[PDB]
DNA sequence: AAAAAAAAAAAAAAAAAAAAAAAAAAA
DNA sequence: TTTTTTTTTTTTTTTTTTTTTTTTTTT
């Protein structure tokens, strides 16, 4: 049911345009999924699109990324369809960073069918002396309404983007992507402020859009004010488009997720969704919409230590068992992915497969170089298929002493006695006499020479070393 | 738990000499970015850090070069000081200082270090101890929690001294037995070698003299035989007596009176020295074998670290992994003029092991050196989580640059928890900086430039609302 | 020293721009702008637990600033024993 | 003028973002483009005809793109009517866009002064998709990028047909192709211009081309005579007044850059943007000087052509040269002060360059010290003064002769070691030296032993002295 | 002189089977090589250097150059490199130097087989020295220049900033005067050998003198006792024959003549040692003077290039200075060399080595190589820059790009100039006349078998392999 | 025409000598 | 405090040993 007093908002977040645009397999994933998102916005006749940040993957998007974003925004967000909602807010303080401080659909030279309200994510936060972002370029072109950007480092005062369609009224609070520790410092110094309308304050929805880390520094979710009714959350790619309320916060938390698989995290394997928000006065109804152009991502984690039945650390042929088990797991995951690819034709054929093998009981990883060579044209991440990792005494003196004793018993010393050169070397190392070896050698030489001289032994080599052996034995 | 907080550079290389030119740089956590033109002074900061920590000048540089040149200064002498403030392992605040002087004398130039100061805070009061550049090492080496070898090679590796893992066998072995803290056993081994060569030279000289002493011995024995025969003839003739007297006088020369004794003594000393030489060879071989066993046994768990690091970081289906491997020389002896050191970084190209040296690329060498340094930092720099990467993205392509940024981000995440990790990055690549700063660790970065007088200056800049 | 010139059929007060501003509700009417004075800094009731966390982290910040002051005055310390 | 007059503002090389990171030199091209757009708005021009190189970099930075977008939105968009038609197939003229129509014809864009531009070589299309910065501008809807080359093999130029009242204009265009390629295409007869088959002589043709003029020369002979006004680019010497060569029936216009990109002696002339007024086949080009373009004064000096003050071997000429340069840069720093009055928009710090050419043996002075004097008076302190210019056997023989005549030879004969070394060098005889050393000892030793010398230490020396 | 084609087989990562023969065609005036790390970009320059001069990459002994016989899992890896090019006159020559790396026991034998020279299409087998000289004559530059200026390795690229002895070897190979240093080594070795012989002979001298003294004492006893016997008793006859036996002994028979001859030899070798010391000092001074005279000319080029290129205000200019040791002698254990690149910070000259930055060092090395190419590479206009922007900052990268573009413009006036660049920088490729010159570049990657491939890519895909 | 034994040249890399500062007497 | 002699490190030139190349000398 869509009355004249309903707010259909297509809440997307973390589109991450241009992500891996140089890849031959995943080059056009983000653009296609943004095309699908805009198609959903156009087909559902939404009032406006509410992007949660990180619309671009890079701080300075490439020419292809910006051109594709402009093409899609002009194709879908520009039209002759009348806008149904008001803006009773001081537009020179919400969008008043550009030299055109008014909402894009109200410009006398632009015809906007679907207004776009967005915040900037930490991948595309403003930089430089002029403090410009990619969303600034989009807003200057006239396609997006960049709102919620902070102006002063010392303190932040956000101004709601007041909207009203019929009876219903929404206060669209928005915060940019301040660095997590800096924003934490603002939240503990009471240097953050939320300006609510002065009167009728209890008749606004107070929708808040924030792009920050959550339970993952981390901006905890209890620092946020208690008057909010919905909190869209970005910088979190595991979809939770379903609104969730904790024990005591009096507001709902929606996590739209991402439009693409950026990292290979375990929480990133969840099915990506885009929201379809509806507001009628005070009530909310978020309807999840699956995206059929998002590449699949299946992962498995195995710890070889916790399977003593098959994985025997002392088995000389255990490496081939590891390789066979990993091959079977990858084949099972690929078959499962193929079984789910017959529902729709839009999902890319090559899925994302990740297999983290934790070896800790003295296992040797196999040839990951050649194992991944058996899926060159069957997976979308040929290089990153298997991840090997381990989750997180010896003294040279004993070794040298042991070697010295072993040598003395495996060859026969000729002049120097047993356990004398070992202690000489030990003294040189520890006490730093720096003359112990020479002193010992000279002392033994002079002692044996004096004995040989006083013993009255004729000058012939055989008798000389015979008496030398006699002295060593005695 | 050890962090370098702030620095004061004065008179070092291109920095100014007047106290108005004293530049101060405060290191942030967990990432510190240094940018600037060529010759600005970015590397000079790490050189100052290394000199403060360990007292060693940059490679190829003596005391005369590290400090500002008096000729360019148009001054008779130049006095430099570097002040570092930090926390030791327990978190106590310690400030150290090292002074310096270069005097321009005639054509050459003379260098000399003045006494440095150690300052702490005990019971709320301030103390100072003027020390002599040998207590300002040991003491602050113990304070930082890491040894001099790791501080020189792993943490504050000079830009020129980088890629030291891919160096010659003897150089790599020296780096790794300073790192493993076994230098004195190699000192004992070399003392054994030197004493063996000395005794061998003595044996050669003894043989040379023994030839002449045998000639003397036989001639004297013949003289004695003729003396006895002539006495027997006479006792059974004035000229006969005169001949007897003359032959006794021939026995009276110094090389004949003492003939048997010197030959006997020299025989005994040469034979005993030869036997001592054999036993010294045996002991030298044993000690060398033990040292190369210990080396291999302590590179066991670093190779194990290096393998995972290289597999995670390197983006190429070329090398399975790399590891450091050493092998003792079987036919080694203390009398050998040149020894052989089989201490090489090995690349696992497939199922066969090759030698990385002379067989890798510039980017592969840079990545391997970075991975080896990071593994050594994980193994040894546990109490002092600092590492200074001087242009780590040199000769690295796009994929390896991105993977190195990801690996450094993972290291930052895994070491900033309950510990302080300070990654000092001096780069000319804005992309590497953006990749590291996507986690929002960078709020202020240092831009080193020069004033009109061409003296280095350090000024803090802001990423937001200020130029980059 | 010339160019190839070949002919094709390319043809396929007064205005020729196609634009009519689609009206938005509130266009040309009195602008009922809300902002400036009627924007107050609302509060957060009691939130003791939240107050506890904020105060504890503020104490952590105060301790860190105390250490930083000691660091600053240690660095500014002039070396009295610098004669050598 | 009247209802049947085309008014076109021709600014060609804006070069936005040039020296953006520079402190004094930054924020100059943006202001010059602001002035150009102000002039277009004030003159009520029909449309703006850019000549390429609108951006300095191939991928313009965020500041450059944002400033260009804000200026285009402020000046080129509004409620002012459009008075001309587009009779050509908009799918071919502007069809490398998902929106193949003119920007003012779009049902969601209100454009007062449409912009028709070609791409220069500094911002030519690069990448897999073959995109340029003008592509981003056209996607935003402020620029009508026309004249893009689709096929590498051949060039077909289809004009953007225009018509205001009775007058007709054929707007040919061509982005900057690599000059050697484009030259090879022109030689191979692979460049064609498609003219309307209706009212063939009733169209005023004008070509907008961004190429070199002085293999890389693409001269004027390589343009047909059916056109009548060839606007040009990749040329910063402001020749905005049209010229007609006797051999070429088509006019040539060279609006030039709006900024001083290089310190060549071709940017020291004042820059103008041209107000054009076609009215049928009658054209009237009227220049408009730029009041915000930084001044550029420069002189070329050749030290070898003044044999009256610059003595080649004078021990103190290196100070007379510095004095002459100091006096020169000072008349220009003053001629700049005297010429800056009235023009409140002129930047205070001018551009001064001096090229010093020496070939008689002069030694350049410390360019750092000379540039340390004028640091807050010239806009480019780093680049003030340019300085430029347009055997073993015999030596060892001479040195050996000098050594022989200098010190007393003990035993070796005169001119023996020199010939030994010469034999070793050429004949590569490796024993040419040892042999001689040995043969001299062997000889004189013999000589000595025949005379059964007393072997006294100093008496043998006298025997060798006899030699 | 220019290079056209190259065919690599079995070198480093390039494949061994005949199906993996990669072919690369060099463009003019700019050729770009891009690819991942450890792909084969630098291996191409190594192959060019090896086919030009026969010298392996620094640190390579020829067994680490051929494809490891183990990674190929073979017992022999036959490696062939071909290079089709034009000599100074303009004729086509191709050389096909080959080698094998046989695997036996735990070692790895290496050897080079006979290459061939093709010229109509006359192919003849040749030995390494003959192909080396032939290609040196054909290209028009010396082997030292080919090794150090044109095709220097990525690791041996900062050679002008090396130690004094190494720099002197590089520069006297460059100046073609190595035979004189070979003569200096011969003179030093002769003097050292004669000194050692003199030491041993003087050690023997005392013994000989003592033997002579004993012989004289025996002879005086003989004379006195013979006089006593002639005056006159039986014992005076007995001691006579014993004395005759003593004189009969060889030790005291001819001791006088042997001692005299040894002393004569001793004095002779002493004066010859002195003479050779004087000659060695004179020849060393002559060589240093020749170096200074032949290097002052290129000092001007180095100065001007540094002044144009180096954007900083630290160093006024750089040059290279050689100073002979005043107190040198052939008997010295260690010599001291004073070859040094010198930087002038204001008015005082300093040693650049050990006193410069990484970017300063790489820029100085580039300037030295470009100056030596201006002086010596007139006949062969090729220079291969393996990552020229390795440590340069943004301003110096831009200035180096401008200088290289100016060199391309100037040196293309009558002869072909090639500037083969291996790089990972998109901005440098852009600024190096990306639109003007480069249309097709080269990507070096690896197939599924980890054998390097060389593929020609259009400039549209340039950004995929660079950052 | 081919083998192989031996002598010569190259160079990578370990060894060592000269310089200079540090330390240790030493008055 | 300063002088003077001995130690130690560095670093840059020297020496060595193995390998390849080449020469020769035979078959
Ligand atoms: N003794 C000295 N006196 C004066 N200037 C010096 C001295 N030693 C080095 N320099 C100069 O000081 C600068 C040192 O900067 P450096 O830290 O090496 O640069 P970067 O940070 O670019 O790597 C260089 O210009 C160098 O030539
Ligand atoms: F690894 Be290559 F040198 F870029
Ligand atoms: Mg540096
Ligand atoms: Mg390389
Ligand atoms: Mn141009």
Mutate: best of C70, C74, C80, C83, partner B, most B CBs <10 A: C74
Contacts of A439 (CB under 8 A, 6+ apart): A424, A433
Contacts of B78 (CB under 8 A, 6+ apart): B11, B17, B67, B68, B69, B70, B101, B102
For residues B422 and B27, is the Cβ–Cβ distance under 8 A?
A: yes
Dihedral angle of Cα D79, D80, D86, D90, to the nearest 10 degrees: -30
Q: Do chains A and D touch (3 or more CB pairs under 8 A)?
A: yes
Q: Are strands E348-351 and E339-345 parallel, antiparallel or unpaired?
A: antiparallel
Nearest to A83 among C24, C44, C47 (CB): C24
Q: Do chains A and B touch (3 or more CB pairs under 8 A)?
A: yes
Minimal CA–CA distance to B425: which of B382, B395, B393?
Answer: B393
Half-sphere exposure of B370 (CA within 13 A, CB side): 29
For residues A403 and B285, is the Cβ–Cβ distance under 8 A?
A: no
- DSSP secondary structure code for residue B81 in this structure: E
Q: Identify which of E12, E37, E443, E452 to mutate to test ligand 2's pocket (most ligand atoms within 8 A of the CB).
A: E37
| 3-state SS assignment for residue A135 | helix
For residues B44 and B82, is the Cβ–Cβ distance under 8 A?
A: no
| 3-state SS assignment for residue D296 | strand
- Residue A199: how many other CB atoms lie within 10 Å: 10
Q: Identify which of E357, E359, E390 to mutate to test ligand 1's pocket (most ligand atoms within 8 A of the CB).
A: E357
Which nucleotide is closest to the Cα of B168 by its C1'? F13
A19-to-A28, D101, E80, E271 alpha-carbon distances in Å: 9, 31, 42, 82
- Structural fold of domain B4-183+383-462: Rossmann fold (3.40.50)
Q: What is the CA radius of gyration of chain A?
A: 36
Minimal CA–CA distance to E148: which of E24, E226, E58?
Answer: E58
CA B153 – CA B372 distance, rounded (Å): 11
CA B317 – CA B179 distance, rounded (Å): 32
CA E179 – CA E182 distance, rounded (Å): 5
Q: How far is the CA of E1 from the C1' of F7 (A)?
A: 39
* Last residue before each break in chain B (C–N > 2.5 Å): 236
- DSSP secondary structure code for residue A349 in this structure: S
B413 is in an annotated binding site: no
DSSP string, E247-297: HHSHHHHSHHHHHHHHHHHHHHHHHHHHHHHHHHHHHHHHHHHHHHHHHHH
Give yes or no for a cis peptide into B227 (omega within 30° of 0): no
B336 is in an annotated binding site: no
CA E142 – CA E176 distance, rounded (Å): 8
Contacts of E268 (CB under 8 A, 6+ apart): D411, D441, D444, D445, D448, D464
Return the structure tokens found at D419: 């010939």
Q: Are strands E78-86 and E92-95 parallel, antiparallel or unpaired?
A: antiparallel
Return the structure tokens found at E288: 């240093």
B95-to-A221, B83, B85, B116, D334 alpha-carbon distances in Å: 41, 7, 4, 11, 55
Return the structure tokens found at C38: 């009627």
Query: B310-335: string of b/e by CB count within 10 Å (b at 16+)?
Result: bbbbbbbbbbbbbbbebebeeeeebe
Return the structure tokens found at A415: 């002049």
- Residue E214: how many other CB atoms lie within 10 Å: 16
Q: Specify the ligand 1 atom closest to the Cα of E359.
A: 22
Minimal CA–CA distance to A113: which of C26, C18, D107, D112?
Answer: D107
Dihedral angle of Cα E452, E455, E461, E463, to the nearest 10 degrees: 40
Which nucleotide is closest to the Cα of B57 by its C1'? G10
E40 is in an annotated binding site: yes
Give the largest Cα separation in chain A, rounded: 128
Return the structure tokens found at D448: 């000595």
Contacts of D175 (CB under 8 A, 6+ apart): D52, D118, D119, D120, D124, D125, D132, D147, D148, D149, D210
Return the structure tokens found at D77: 């968009």
For residues B381 and E58, is the Cβ–Cβ distance under 8 A?
A: no
**Cβ contact B107 with chain F strand, < 7 A:** no
Residue E20 CB burial class (10 angstroms; 0-12, 13-18, ≥19): middle
Method of structure determination: cryo-EM
DSSP string, C21-74: ----TTSSS------TTSEEE------HHHHHHHHHHHHHHHHHHHHHHHHHHH
The helix or strand, by DSSP H or E, that contains position E385, with its residue range, turns out to be: strand E385-386
Minimal CA–CA distance to E113: which of E74, E78, E66?
Answer: E78
- DSSP secondary structure code for residue B377 in this structure: H
For residues A65 and A58, is the Cβ–Cβ distance under 8 A?
A: yes
Cβ-Cβ contacts under 8 Å, B24 against chain C: 75
Q: Identify which of B7, B10, B14, B156 to mutate to test ligand 1's pocket (most ligand atoms within 8 A of the CB).
A: B14
Asked: is E2-162+372-464 a CATH 3.40.50.300 domain? The reply is yes
For residues E419 and E151, is the Cβ–Cβ distance under 8 A?
A: no
Cβ-Cβ contacts under 8 Å, A188 against chain C: 54, 57-58, 61
Nearest to A90 among C25, C33, C49 (CB): C33
- DSSP secondary structure code for residue D122 in this structure: G
The answer, for D96 touching chain A at a CB cutoff of 8 Å, is no
E49 is in an annotated binding site: no
Which nucleotide is closest to the Cα of B341 by its C1'? F14
Dihedral angle of Cα B135, B141, B145, B146, to the nearest 10 degrees: -150
Q: What is the CA radius of gyration of chain E?
A: 33
Torsion over CA: E28, E32, E38, E39 (sign): negative
For residues A213 and A219, is the Cβ–Cβ distance under 8 A?
A: yes
Dihedral angle of Cα A417, A418, A423, A424, to the nearest 10 degrees: 30
According to DSSP, the residues that pair with B438 across neighbouring strands are none
| Inter-axis angle of helices E255-309 and D392-406, nearest 10 | 130
For residues B451 and B11, is the Cβ–Cβ distance under 8 A?
A: no
CA A251 – CA D408 distance, rounded (Å): 107
The helix or strand, by DSSP H or E, that contains position A116, with its residue range, turns out to be: strand A116-118
Half-sphere exposure of B15 (CA within 13 A, CB side): 28
Contacts of A404 (CB under 8 A, 6+ apart): A421, A422, A425, B283, B286, B287, B290
Q: How far is the CA of E54 from the C1' of G21 (A)?
A: 13
CA B446 – CA B27 distance, rounded (Å): 9
Which ligand number lies closest to the CA of residue E312? Answer: 1
According to DSSP, the residues that pair with E33 across neighbouring strands are E422, E442
- DSSP secondary structure code for residue E207 in this structure: H
What angle (nearest 5°) sits at the alpha carbon of residue A70, between those of residues A65 and A72? Answer: 95
DSSP string, E159-206: GGGS-HHHHHHHHHHHTT-HHHHHHHHHHHHHHHHHHHHHHHHHHHHH
- Residue D363: how many other CB atoms lie within 10 Å: 11
Nearest to A70 among D59, D74, D136 (CB): D136
Minimal CA–CA distance to A49: which of A23, A3, A2, A11?
Answer: A11
Minimal CA–CA distance to A275: which of A11, A7, A66?
Answer: A11
Minimal CA–CA distance to E339: which of E326, E356, E351?
Answer: E351
According to DSSP, the residues that pair with B93 across neighbouring strands are B87
Q: Are strands B352-355 and B385-390 parallel, antiparallel or unpaired?
A: unpaired
Yes or no, beta carbons of B115 and C84 under 8 Å apart: yes
Distance of alpha carbon A167 from its chain centroid, rounded? Answer: 43
Yes or no, beta carbons of B452 and D21 under 8 Å apart: no
CA A254 – CA A276 distance, rounded (Å): 12
Q: How many residues does chain B have?
A: 468
Return the structure tokens found at A31: 């653009």
Q: How far is the CA of E76 from the C1' of G22 (A)?
A: 23
Please tell me if the CB atom of residue B129 comes closer than 6 angstroms to any atom of ligand 1. Answer: no
Contacts of E275 (CB under 8 A, 6+ apart): D409, D410, D411, D412, D417
CA D58 – CA D120 distance, rounded (Å): 9
CA D76 – CA D86 distance, rounded (Å): 18
| 3-state SS assignment for residue D11 | coil
What angle (nearest 5°) sits at the alpha carbon of residue E127, between those of residues E122 and E131? Answer: 65
CA A429 – CA B358 distance, rounded (Å): 36
| 3-state SS assignment for residue A356 | strand
CB pairs under 8 A, 24+ apart, for B56-59? B56/B148, B56/B152, B58/B158, B58/B160, B58/B161, B58/E354, B59/B158, B59/B160, B59/B161
| 3-state SS assignment for residue D53 | coil
Q: How far is the CA of B183 from the C1' of G8 (A)?
A: 15
Minimal CA–CA distance to B363: which of B408, B324, B308, B318?
Answer: B318
Give yes or no for a cis peptide into C10 (omega within 30° of 0): no
Please give the sequence-ordered ranges of beta strands (E in DSSP) within D97-196, or none if there are none.
115-117, 144-145, 155-157, 160-164, 167-174, 191-196
DSSP H stretches of helix in D311-391: 317-339, 367-371
Return the structure tokens found at B170: 């003897």
| Domains of chain A, first to last | 9-290 (3.60.21.10), 297-389 (3.30.110.110), 396-473 (no CATH)
Q: A130 phi and psi, to 5 degrees?
A: -80, -15
Nucleotides of G under 7 A from a protein CB: 1, 8, 10-17, 19-22
Nearest to D110 among A100, A109, A112 (CB): A109
Domain edges within chain E: 2-162+372-464, 185-287
Cβ-Cβ contacts under 8 Å, E464 against chain A: 22
Half-sphere exposure of A211 (CA within 13 A, CB side): 31
A with D: how many residue pairs have Cβ under 8 Å apart?
84
Dihedral angle of Cα E177, E179, E182, E184, to the nearest 10 degrees: -70
Q: How far is the CA of D387 from the C1' of F14 (A)?
A: 49
CA E318 – CA E370 distance, rounded (Å): 14
Instruction: Please identify among residues 41-80 of chain A the ones whose CB lies closer than 8 Å to any CB of chain C.
Output: 80
Cβ-Cβ contacts under 8 Å, D372 against chain B: 452
Distance from CA of C44 to the nearest CA of A (A): 6
Q: How far apart are the first and last CA of chain E?
A: 33
Distance from CA of A179 to the nearest CA of B (A): 5
Return the structure tokens found at A216: 């993952």
Minimal CA–CA distance to B23: which of B34, B8, B13, B41?
Answer: B8
- Residue D436: how many other CB atoms lie within 10 Å: 20
The answer, for D365 touching chain A at a CB cutoff of 8 Å, is no
The helix or strand, by DSSP H or E, that contains position D392, with its residue range, turns out to be: helix D392-406
For residues B8 and B81, is the Cβ–Cβ distance under 8 A?
A: yes
Q: Are strands A161-165 and A116-118 parallel, antiparallel or unpaired?
A: unpaired
Q: Give helix then strand counts, H and E, for chain D.
A: 11, 18
The answer, for B464 touching chain D at a CB cutoff of 8 Å, is no
Contacts of D10 (CB under 8 A, 6+ apart): D49, D51, D231, D240, D253, D255, D273, D274, D276
The helix or strand, by DSSP H or E, that contains position A172, with its residue range, turns out to be: strand A168-175
Half-sphere exposure of D284 (CA within 13 A, CB side): 7
The helix or strand, by DSSP H or E, that contains position B311, with its residue range, turns out to be: helix B300-313
- DSSP secondary structure code for residue A106 in this structure: G
Q: What is the CA radius of gyration of chain C?
A: 36
Strand order in D285-289's β-sheet?
D144-145, D115-117, D47-50, D6-10, D272-278, D285-289
For residues E81 and E45, is the Cβ–Cβ distance under 8 A?
A: no
Q: How far is the CA of B157 from the C1' of G4 (A)?
A: 38
């Amino acid at each position: 049911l869509d009355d004249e007093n309903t707010f259909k908002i297509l809440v997307a977040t973390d589109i991450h345009l241009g992500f891996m645009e140089k890849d031959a397999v995943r080059g056009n994933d983000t653009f296609v999924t943004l095309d699908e998102i805009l198609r959903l916005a156009q087909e559902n006749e939404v009032d406006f699109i509410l992007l949660g940040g990180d619309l671009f993957h890079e701080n300075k998007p490439s020419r292809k990324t910006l051109h594709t974003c402009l093409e899609l925004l002009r194709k879908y967000c520009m039209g002759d369809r009348p806008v149904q909602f008001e803006i009773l807010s001081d537009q020179s303080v919400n969008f008043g960073f550009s030299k055109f401080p008014w909402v894009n659909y109200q410009d006398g030279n632009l015809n906007i069918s679907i207004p776009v309200f967005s915040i900037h994510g930490n991948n595309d936060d403003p930089t430089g002396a002029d403090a410009l972002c990619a969303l600034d370029i989009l807003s200057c072109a006239g396609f997006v309404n960049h709102f919620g950007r902070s102006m002063s480092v010392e303190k932040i005062d956000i101004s709601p983007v007041l909207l009203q369609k019929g009876s219903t009224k929404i206060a669209l609070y928005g915060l940019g992507s301040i660095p997590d520790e800096r924003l934490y410092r603002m939240f503990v110094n009471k240097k953050v402020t939320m300006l609510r309308p002065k009167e009728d304050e209890n008749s606004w929805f107070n929708l808040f859009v924030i792009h920050q880390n959550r339970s993952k520094n981390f901006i905890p979710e209890q620092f946020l004010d208690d008057f909010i009714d919905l909190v869209i959350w970005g910088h979190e790619h595991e979809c939770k488009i379903a609104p969730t309320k904790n024990e005591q916060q009096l507001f709902y938390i929606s996590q739209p997720g991402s439009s693409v698989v950026t990292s290979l995290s375990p929480g990133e394997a969840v099915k990506k969704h885009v929201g379809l928000l509806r507001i009628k006065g005070r009530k909310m109804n978020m309807h999840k919409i699956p995206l059929h152009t998002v590449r699949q991502f299946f992962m498995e984690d195995i710890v070889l230590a916790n399977h003593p039945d098959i994985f025997n650390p002392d088995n000389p042929k255990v490496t081939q068992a590891i390789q066979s088990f990993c091959l079977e797991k990858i084949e099972e995951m690929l078959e499962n992915a193929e079984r789910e690819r017959l529902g729709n034709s839009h999902q890319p054929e090559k899925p994302l497969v990740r297999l983290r093998v934790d070896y800790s009981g003295g296992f040797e990883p196999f040839s990951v170089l050649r194992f991944s060579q058996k899926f060159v044209d069957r997976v979308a991440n040929p290089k990153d298929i298997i991840h090997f990792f381990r989750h997180r005494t010896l003294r040279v003196e004993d070794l040298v002493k042991q070697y010295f004793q072993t040598a003395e018993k495996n060859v026969q010393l000729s002049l120097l006695t047993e356990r004398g050169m070992g202690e000489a070397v030990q003294e040189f190392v520890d006490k730093e006499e720096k003359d112990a070896i020479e002193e010992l050698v000279k002392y033994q030489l002079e002692k044996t020479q004096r004995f040989l001289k006083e013993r009255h032994i004729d000058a012939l080599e055989d008798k000389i070393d015979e008496e030398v052996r006699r002295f060593r034995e005695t | 738990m050890s962090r370098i907080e702030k620095m004061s550079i004065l008179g070092v290389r291109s920095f100014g000499i007047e106290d108005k030119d004293k530049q101060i740089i405060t290191f942030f956590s967990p990432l510190t970015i240094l940018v600037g033109p060529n010759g600005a002074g970015k590397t000079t900061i790490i050189e100052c850090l290394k000199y403060i920590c360990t007292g060693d000048f940059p490679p190829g540089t003596k005391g005369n070069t590290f400090v500002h040149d008096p000729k360019v200064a148009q001054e008779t002498d130049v006095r430099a000081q570097i002040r570092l403030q930090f926390r030791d392992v327990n978190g106590e605040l310690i400030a150290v200082q090292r002074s310096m002087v270069c005097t321009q004398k005639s054509k050459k130039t003379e260098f000399k270090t003045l006494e440095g100061v150690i300052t702490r805070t005990k019971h709320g009061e301030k103390v100072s101890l003027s020390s002599k550049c040998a207590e300002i090492d040991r003491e602050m080496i113990s304070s930082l929690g890491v040894s001099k070898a790791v501080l020189n090679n792993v943490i504050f590796c000079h830009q020129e001294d980088s890629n030291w893992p891919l160096s010659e066998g003897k150089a790599l072995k020296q780096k790794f037995d300073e790192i493993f803290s076994a230098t004195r056993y190699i000192k004992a081994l070399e003392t054994l070698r030197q004493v063996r060569q000395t005794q061998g030279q003595k044996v050669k000289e003894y043989q040379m003299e023994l030839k002449y002493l045998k000639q003397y011995k036989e001639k004297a024995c013949e003289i004695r035989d003729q003396i006895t025969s002539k006495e027997a003839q006479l006792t059974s003739q004035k000229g006969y007596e005169e001949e007897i007297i003359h032959f006794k006088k021939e026995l009276r020369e110094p090389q004949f009176r003492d003939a048997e004794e010197k030959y006997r003594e020299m025989m005994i000393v040469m034979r005993t020295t030869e036997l001592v030489n054999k036993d010294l060879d045996i002991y030298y071989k044993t000690l060398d074998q033990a040292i190369m066993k210990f080396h291999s046994m302590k590179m066991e768990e670093i190779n194990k670290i290096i393998r995972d690091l290289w597999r995670s970081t390197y983006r190429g289906q070329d090398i399975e992994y790399i590891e450091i491997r050493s092998d003792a020389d079987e036919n080694v002896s203390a009398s050998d003029k040149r020894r052989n050191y089989n201490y090489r970084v090995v690349m696992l190209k497939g199922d066969t092991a090759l030698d990385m040296r002379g067989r890798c690329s510039a980017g592969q060498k840079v990545l391997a050196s970075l991975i080896i340094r990071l593994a050594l930092a994980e193994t040894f720099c546990l109490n002092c989580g600092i590492i200074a990467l001087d242009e780590p993205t040199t000769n690295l392509d796009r994929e390896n640059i991105e993977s190195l940024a990801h690996a450094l981000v993972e290291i930052i995440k895994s070491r900033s928890q309950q510990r302080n990790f300070q990654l000092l990055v001096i780069t000319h690549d804005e992309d590497f900086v953006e990749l590291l700063g996507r986690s929002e660790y960078v709020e202020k970065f240092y831009r080193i430039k020069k004033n009109i007088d061409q003296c280095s200056e350090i000024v803090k800049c802001s990423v937001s609302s200020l130029g980059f | 020293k010339l160019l190839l010139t070949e002919f094709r059929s390319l043809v396929i007060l007064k205005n020729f721009k196609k634009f009519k501003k689609v009206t938005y509700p509130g266009a040309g009417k009195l602008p009922h702008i809300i902002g400036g004075s009627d924007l107050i800094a609302h509060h957060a009731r009691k939130n003791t637990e939240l107050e506890e966390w904020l105060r504890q982290e503020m104490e952590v910040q105060n301790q860190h600033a105390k250490e930083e002051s000691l660091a600053d005055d240690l660095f500014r310390y002039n070396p009295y024993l610098k004669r050598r």
